[model samples]
Target: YAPAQAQIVHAGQACVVKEDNISERVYTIREGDTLMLQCLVTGHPRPQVRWTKTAGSASDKFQETSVFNETLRIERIARTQGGRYYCKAENGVGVPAIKSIRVDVQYLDEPMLTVHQTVKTVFLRCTVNSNPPARFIWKRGSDTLSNGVDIYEPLYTQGETKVLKLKNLRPQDYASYTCQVSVRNVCGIPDKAITFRLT
Candidate 1:
């Protein structure tokens, strides 16, 4: 996991190396979507590919194949299965040179919201888990309201999951809004929506 560059914007979301050899492209696994891997080698013979996730990230949520025909794919994924992933390839010989490609998976779980009645501002926040770090998508019910709405996510890519702020607040805006999260290029976890109501 890369250390997050903290900003006044938000937390939980962090930044990682994006340049080649330093970073990897991230993607979210959507419904009916498939994630595949292919390994290229300059050895005597073609190298074999193996896929894995970060320690403790492996679960039944993702399916793996040892002899997956030089490629491995994950079909139909959710947030609970979100985490750090990689593809390691080894030559069919004694010592295999392992090259790991990064995979990111993120989702929303539990979050505590705070609202300031006087200023009409709402503070909504949640934590994100990933290797290179993942971006966040905050929504209010089905509206998918932006910062213009009383509730907005000023902070998306954070590291420590510190605190998030929604500048403006409104009585009518109080309802059910969900938080949609996607890893750079791995899997789409579950959606978590926070309800806002002032009575």
Candidate 2:
């Protein structure tokens, strides 16, 4: 067989340059504030950059922000703006280089309760949007519920959804079950109480 051929390297055509703002990890945005995420890249023949959602993947569309430029700006930001973003750079190179950026939009809101009750157990769900992922706590009237207790086993959280499981529930435990969320700082929920009566 003939000798194997190796790829040729040009001066600047395939050289991938490092981005200055690629080191930025997380960005927290306030309500109604504008969001601007920048990604600057340079390469031989000039690298083209594009941004996409990396974490909290969704089919939702972005704001009126420009997607073609080196900067992505989302106006009138809200809690839905929080997610992991990625910038891809390519210029007919061997492979594209990607830069990761994390964005968080904080909010304060009462937990939404989706309750379901059975003969011997009760299920309660709490969901909200907040940066740094909101913390969940379950309480009945004034007394707090803990994991592996009389009624409540433990609290389960996945992203923004928190679940409260109550087993071996008695008639006395059929009052109000509050699912409150703890915001990191500044914002909070006034009341996150939900009541369920047994039949």
Candidate 3:
């Protein structure tokens, strides 16, 4: 008998991520809003789909399911739920198909204040955490405080933090001071304010 010959055959196609079927790879949503991400895939033998959080602050806060397990959904998403996600498809064929997605949640944290005092100087510091940053406002009663040399020195601001310095420690400077913060580009989020009394 002649030498044995082996037969080569092609059974099916490998998995491929359907790019056009996906609408958005990057998503931005407000806190408490719903988020849905879809990953469409194609392959012979019909690929199995699964979603996973590869990296983010909120890895344990994800839920996924679809007709073919092709969708990732987060109901009432929180700020900590923002992070990167991966969609994988495999059919025991060639290499598995993967798609990366990014999710961002917009939110504002409460502002906090700290105080430092010397013999003749008093410093009031305020800080907050926000996704899109925030605007800081310093107020004494109904009057808004600004950078000046009359009673307050030039205000110092960086990121979403601010410092207000009162020189000479006048009697009027011992009143209650308010720190208010607000954010832009998001709806339904209310402004936050905190009051600090100095003596």
Candidate 4:
């Protein structure tokens, strides 16, 4: 319903980094952290939830973690996963009221990108599922374009999971593209992503 911390929050440190109606502080942070983020959103579910996150481009990274007691997690927060989040809760009341939760994370070490060379344009993808949802981004060579490694135009989108499509196979599109993942809360695996290329 609101991006600001619930008037009441879980037991721990209580700091109001920033607050607003449609957004929150750029991100929350702890002095000695291994991650950075820009923004994030939170949502509620209908018991059977449909939670999701997105990256600016398609080549970002994503992952699925093993669940325990109806819970999931992601790691490595990035500045990219900062945005609006939605939650669809259905207690059979007024047609599943939808609430929104936004969260932001802070991190250090700006992400760098690389590519492996060969004959095939590699397809890379990244994503995360965190409170407020996790988004991602891609880095290629010396460029920081959202879908920087696009060879045949952009075939990426939101919803149906984050994706990266490569075409015109060649040795120039061969490098390790790091998919930086980020979330709202300061828990989970930290920062997580994948690296791929063709030989």
Among these predicted structures, which one has the highest lDDT?
Answer: 3
lDDT of each: 0.45, 0.57, 0.64, 0.39
Clash counts per candidate, in order, are 19, 0, 0, 33
Comparing 3 and 4 on TM-score, the stronger one:
3
Off by over 4 Å in 4: 1-11, 14-122, 141-143, 146-160, 184-190
Error of 3 at 114 (Å): 2.1
Estimate the overall C-alpha local distance difference test score of candidate 4: 0.39
Q: What is candidate 4's CA lDDT for residue 184?
A: 38
After TM-score superposition, what is the CA distance of residue 36 in candidate 3 from its true location, in Å? 1.8
TM-score attained by model 4: 0.33
Model 1 C-alpha lDDT per residue in residues 9-51, reported as the tens digit of each score: 1112322223354334444344344455454444544555555
Estimate, for each residue in 1-199, the C-alpha lDDT of model 4 and write its tens digit.
Answer: 2222112111122123455664333334332333222222233322333333442455323422121222223344345654543333333333433333444544333223344334644455444444335556554534355333452212553322354556565666556555665553353335555555445
Q: What is candidate 3's CA lDDT for residue 133?
A: 78
The residue-level lDDT of candidate 3 at 79 comes to 80
What TM-score fits each model?
A: 0.40, 0.47, 0.66, 0.33
Question: How do the residues 80-160 of candidate 2 rate in per-residue lDDT, one tens digit apiece?
Answer: 666766676666765666666556665666557787767866677777656546667767666665644443323565447
- Candidate 4 worst ten-residue window by lDDT: 5-14
Model 2: lowest-lDDT 10 consecutive positions? 6-15
Give the runs in model 3 whose Cα sits over 4 Å from its true position. 1-23, 55-68, 141-160, 170-174, 185-187
